[PDB]
DNA sequence: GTCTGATCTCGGAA
DNA sequence: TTCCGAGATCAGACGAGAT
């Protein structure tokens, strides 16, 4: 059987061409899946293609930690790369932000803005010194001593 | 060899500026816990032992 | 009217400060090299 | 340098008491984590909580068991519907209760097919008597294969507050 | 050559029977031996669509850059037929300035706008893109419900995704993903629509 | 009553983590010791005999919340 | 000493 | 007629730790 593959980026207008049963044809750019054939089909290709390279180089991984990834980096609308650049477009907080890259310029644009911080997650609870709430933080223990709610007296 | 290079640091000085422990072994050491070994002791979900490791008993 | 259309939340500040004419130095028990660009201000003020 | 962008991401994930795993502002990232709600650290191999042809090895060669009238084909399917629907077995989500039932007609095809070749299983007495350990999977070693795949599958859940993309950046930057 | 003067027919009355007109099964399958009596004729607009709802207006303008004027041709004709969205299925894409007037007539009439090439397959039937479904609005408050989860906060797909605009989808509301797999094959996503 | 019958090992950590502080601040003891000085190996003690004065209070991401006793919990 | 998205200037067109 | 595409220049960053 016969396929043929392309160096090139130019996707639907290669999906559409004559001959290329378009409904069965991928990329490797994640972007130009994003663009031309929605985010969902740019979920599936971060999925594939990184198992694609994982078991190309023997190093075997679970696909459940790939489908964590793929679904992080495209859950708000269209394809967000971690970079330094993704990480604005993920997280409100600042202190998370700015324990990150670009600790100059994140602080003072969040000083422009009133910006209002909760703190959460683990890169402000570690800076703050609270108990983070992810893993052994998220519930907390009640005491089962004896007590009641008990009547009070006449007055 | 081993004489040169054993070391443990109860509670010695900390730094003037910081308040953290300092960093050597000529100056009482103190081995920084990175910030790749915070990520270790986040995935393990181990919280109150964070806050045991660098609040408590690095800058209480 | 117009601060929180330039998105300064006004309780936190509004634009009048962006630029200095005092200026906080910072407390002595957190420099014990700045204190060489402080001085040098009071020269040049 | 990358995983120290993977894990400045990723890392203030977990799933949450409901099974959704959330961002720490509140936002679902996923409904389940990864379809099903499983660890990958106790995923066997092929990315399944059980890998069955070894767990009924297993039980059968824990509890032979002598005595045992070890009927099949008529029975074996039988039994694996009494006791499936038994007060039991409504938190296995029917996709893997789906795959103990595939597999289970899978195994039931497999001792028609040895007693198709001899042995009739008439009432259980041939004149050999040994020709009834070909595929012996005896009524009680079926129901502990049952209850044990089920708490197989219960104890490999993603356990709720995990920080899920902790694991995560660990397991693609390593 | 052929391939599309058909196949763009045959994939918007798939489009516009998956956002739930009535196209009769017979006008939904051509070959294009069925398509073959003006086949000769387009080369060398004879091609528009109304269809209604269980009503939509596709439009094939055959200049390649579909200016304001030729907007404006059908303007007077959407407004006359008292119908409220439309199709503009262009060749190469809109004039810049055109797009606008699209958006300043926003709320009256819809009239989206696709490629040619976008149309010439049905991203529906690609076996990367999983279906989509678009939910209704009660189905959005038993989704809410179960998970406690406000409007906001659901996973978040662009109003310009290219299924969303498949689907002629507005702001806020929710589509249910299928994404097969391969232990269960059912694994159900949502999405809230920017 | 929706969420998992079994007790997690973030729960059984916190659990054993603050059992064993309340000890180590001479708690009264549920488990009649035998010799135990580490306050840690008296809270295993305590959580195999099932006697743990502490309900965990597990809070699903809305704000609402479900309590559940350690008594009431499958330990692995 | 590049690799980087952002943000500024030019230019050809409905 | 204006507006959006494509030409230049500009950024912050470039693993742990150890003596």
Redesign the pocket.
Known sequence: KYKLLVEGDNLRAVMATHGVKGTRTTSNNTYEVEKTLGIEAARTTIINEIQYTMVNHGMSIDRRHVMLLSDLMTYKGEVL?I???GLAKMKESVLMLAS??????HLFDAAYFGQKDSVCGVSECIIMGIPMNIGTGLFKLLHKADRDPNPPKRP | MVL??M?ARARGPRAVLTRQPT????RD?????????RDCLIGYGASMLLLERLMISSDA | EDVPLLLMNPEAGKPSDLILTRLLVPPLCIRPDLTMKLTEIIFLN | ?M??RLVKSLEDLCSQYDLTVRSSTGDIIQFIYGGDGLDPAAMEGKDEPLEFKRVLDNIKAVFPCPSEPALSKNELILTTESIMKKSEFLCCQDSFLQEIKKFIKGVSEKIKKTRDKYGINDNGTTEPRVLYQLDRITPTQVEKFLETCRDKYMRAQMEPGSAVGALCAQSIGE | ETYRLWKIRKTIMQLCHDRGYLVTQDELDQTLEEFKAQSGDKPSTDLTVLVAHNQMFVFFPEEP?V???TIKVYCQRMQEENITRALIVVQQGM??????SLVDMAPKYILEQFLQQELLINITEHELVPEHVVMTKEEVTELLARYKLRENQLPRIQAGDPVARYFGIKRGQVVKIIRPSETAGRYITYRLVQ | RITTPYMTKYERARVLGTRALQIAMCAPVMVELEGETDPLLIAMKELKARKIPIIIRRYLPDGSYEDWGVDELIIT
Request: net charge positive; hydrophobic share 20%; glycine share 16%.
């Open positions: 790369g970079t330094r650049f990150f890259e670009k600790t100059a310029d | 040169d290079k070391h960093e050597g072994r000529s050491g103190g081995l920084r816990l990175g910030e790749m070994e | 340098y995983q120290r | 850059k200016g304001i004027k004039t810049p300035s055109a797009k606008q």
